[model samples]
Target: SKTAKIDWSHWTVTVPEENPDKPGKPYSLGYPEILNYAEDKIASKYMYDDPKDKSVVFYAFPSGVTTANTHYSRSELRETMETGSNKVNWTFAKGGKMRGTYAIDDISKEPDGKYSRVIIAQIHGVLTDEQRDLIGQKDNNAPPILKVYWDKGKIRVKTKVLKDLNAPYKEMLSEDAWGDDEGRNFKEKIDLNTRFTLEVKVSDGRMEVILNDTESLVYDDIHMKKWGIFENYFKAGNYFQSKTPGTFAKVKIYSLQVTHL
Candidate 1:
């Protein structure tokens, strides 16, 4: 008998400008509210029982631009688990190219009542000029490092421009364009491919990113500074450039496991 292939579903939900009100928060948008939105407003057509339920939902702005959103799980974190080898293959369906996956583990909570989670994946494809421009200017020329955050059903992300270290924090400037200087060394045209893994401990606020398990980027401070700002940034949806139509291929997801720190 032949093995069954993964089943996939996709959807595009509206990015809410105003967060809904929740209990105990004076009718303000809270984690629980956002989680409710994901469960109710956003359609979940993918299957959890079927091993073949591998669906991709592409969200885009009506203007045909890439929009970003942060998703928070109501499920609390308790411990961490290992996902040996789960793969996610990505290809260009319309505008840009992208391929990656999250090694999601069971939710684990910290002593402070906070939760923890982690993500690991590889991405290879052409970034549109618009996306590149959104990256703004920088110093080291590091390509825009994608950001992901989740807390109590609230998830938000943004392109980052690392501050210069040579000068004082206040005087520091954004890094160089992603592929201009030392950043250029990290940039590869269409044919080049790179692998990356991100491990996060939500309880203790630890973020570790390893590229090909060689070069690693670690962040010890993982606290949400602004709920309002986070909400404003993470309306609701995937945050990659898929509008305008681009070519993508060789997308793959090898693992997505969630575990404790």
Candidate 2:
């Protein structure tokens, strides 16, 4: 076994503004409230039984969004190594890896009526705001170092790089899944219940992953030269759809581990 650098138990849940169209500000949870609820008030759908060992794991299920804007409505559980003064101390700059064992407890669709985004997670941004807002976001997306989301029954990985170290980046250089088959796996998409383990590694300029601890993949062109307002971080949680009513994903996390090697 390799050396472990960071093992976390206190996770941060970020279910940001829903931006409802009804001309009213909806109720929101403060960061303190989020901690209180997560510690004692987190619900059951965010939990599951380990099929292999019969252990139970509780996850951050971030689904309370009801908005019209797909860009703003977000409900996710994130882990950031930032201080109370908003000073962040960690990034995948030198290199690190994260491993998780998860199963699709359920999935939901956006108002677009597509069964996409069964789940959403990100290799978050540790931005310094050189451009004020990369995506004009109090909440945001795209062209971060990486984004990991589930769609069509498989977890997809998207990679991004800051090439210019300046403003007005049109887009990142890379976006694609691991395999030629778009993350084809032994388990079916929406198989109701199946466990899959995802392992990821990051170098100064390379990204690699292993699905099921066997299927190996590598994307060596990803360069992580820290730059611009789009900083970098990591977060895993439930991101809900807001395009329509009656569509949401059920997320359950059994074992999530982030190791700094």
Candidate 3:
């Protein structure tokens, strides 16, 4: 059973983007100008068409931020996890589940980029009031930073967790473990201008993803408390991983609906 439905059209951003021309300079530290409207706005203004290529027109960019106060988001009221300005109105229970759909419009290759173009949609966990200060200071300490990495011809899902408070980041999934399917043997089912649904189920100590109502993946033994968190939320949009100044990543969202079951 579903409890609530969040209007995807009402999302906002937390951190502003650093100027493309001033890559090394300090971040803009503002709201909209620092924002990447070209990418984020497409989700609210457009919808994905089946098998036709609606993804090319929609991409939401959440650029890099050097500051610790700001954040990057493409969901309802983007703000710092510790800010507590706008708490998530949807299901964020530790045992709750979420599902959303998006398509890769394009992945522009960057000559100077580090990971080429990694179009991303992240599952960002929220911090409890008692844990706010620590989470505010150490961003990566936050558990369950799950990401759906969209590549040129494949989709690689990834997750990170910290076993020890002082421990380094631990990768839960990688392209090596799983990649997009070619409609068989995980060959090459995902390509530029292709639409797909991404469903995430998070419980006490595990997570799973079922693709296109067909292929399914499960990763168990994911203790959320070990990472020092109890609840989490999701955000879907183009989070390009290119180190250079460009949208080597772009995606169009057909429909974004999250239900807590």
Model 2 lDDT per residue over 1-261, tens place: 121112333245434333244333322333444334434332223433345554333333233443333343444445544323233424455565777766556666555666646444556554344333643544333344556667666666665544443423434312221112233232434344677777778666566767777666576642444322234555555555344555556555556776565
TM per candidate comes to 0.29, 0.62, 0.60
Please give the clash total of every predicted structure, in order: 49, 9, 10
227: Cα error in model 3, Å: 4.3
Local lDDT at 242 for model 3: 48
Q: Give the winner by TM-score: 1 or 2.
A: 2
Across 127-241, the per-residue lDDT of candidate 3 in tens digits comes to 5444455334343323335666665456677655443334332322111212222221223367665667777776556666667767766655433434334346565555546
lDDT of 2: 0.48
TM-score of 1: 0.29
Q: Between the candidate structures 2 and 3, which one is better when assessed by lDDT?
A: 2
- Highest TM-score: which candidate? 2
